Design a protein around this ligand. Structure first.
Ligand code: VO4
Ligand code: VO4
Length: 210
């Protein structure tokens, strides 16, 4: 009785579709500028959100301003379809105990590592303190990366196609709000054993200004 999530297979129409959503956002200059700032320093911002468990009161004032603009910009940015979104991650994504432990010399993932990954994460909620940068398709940015997550994001969910707002956004980037929880439904290896494939249902964000 599973739901159907669309996967984009046609880059040209993936951009048309994203552009088409974007043209309806009606974002302010300030919200566009905050998105641009996020794309320029995303690893730093998400790193601070993580270290501080989503509490932003201690961040520098200009950053607080940008984060609250970004959080509120999602009021304007929803997906009108059930869509699958992709990202690729490095071993530390699973925990620091996995950082230097996951792969083999051939470049296949370690079965015993992978087995540890599941007991820890399979069939469990995960809260993400940072924003979640994803792509509308499985773009080349990844493919090197040993972990691919496919998020199932339901109609009406907060999700912003930011690729046209910032030249430093990922190809077909779809940004998800920070402080989101998702449920990991499935973890399996790729066919050529180079990748752990994670399928998760996005449950949504705790940040709802309004
Ligand atoms: O230009 V703003 O109205 O986003 O301050
Ligand atoms: O010291 V500040 O939070 O105004 O950068």
């Amino acid at each position: 009785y599973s739901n159907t999530y669309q996967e984009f297979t046609n880059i040209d129409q993936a951009k048309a579709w994203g552009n088409a959503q974007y043209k309806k956002y009606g974002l302010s200059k300030s919200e566009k500028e905050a998105i641009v700032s996020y794309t320029k320093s995303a690893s730093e911002i998400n790193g601070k959100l993580r270290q501080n468990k989503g509490v932003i009161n201690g961040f520098p004032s200009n950053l607080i301003k940008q984060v609250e603009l970004l959080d509120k910009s999602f009021n304007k940015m929803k997906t009108p379809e059930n869509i699958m979104l992709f990202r690729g991650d490095d071993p530390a994504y699973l925990g620091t105990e996995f950082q230097n432990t996951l792969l083999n010399s051939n470049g296949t993932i370690n079965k015993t590592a992978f087995e540890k990954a599941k007991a820890k994460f399979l069939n469990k909620d995960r809260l993400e303190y940072g924003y979640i940068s994803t792509s509308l398709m499985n773009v080349s940015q990844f493919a090197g990366r040993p972990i691919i997550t496919k998020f199932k994001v339901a109609k009406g969910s907060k999700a912003g196609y930011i690729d046209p707002i910032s030249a430093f956004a990922g190809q077909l980037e779809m940004l998800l709000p920070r402080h989101s929880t998702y449920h990991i439904d499935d973890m399996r290896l790729s066919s050529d054993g180079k990748q752990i494939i994670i399928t998760a249902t996005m449950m949504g964000t705790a940040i709802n200004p309004k």
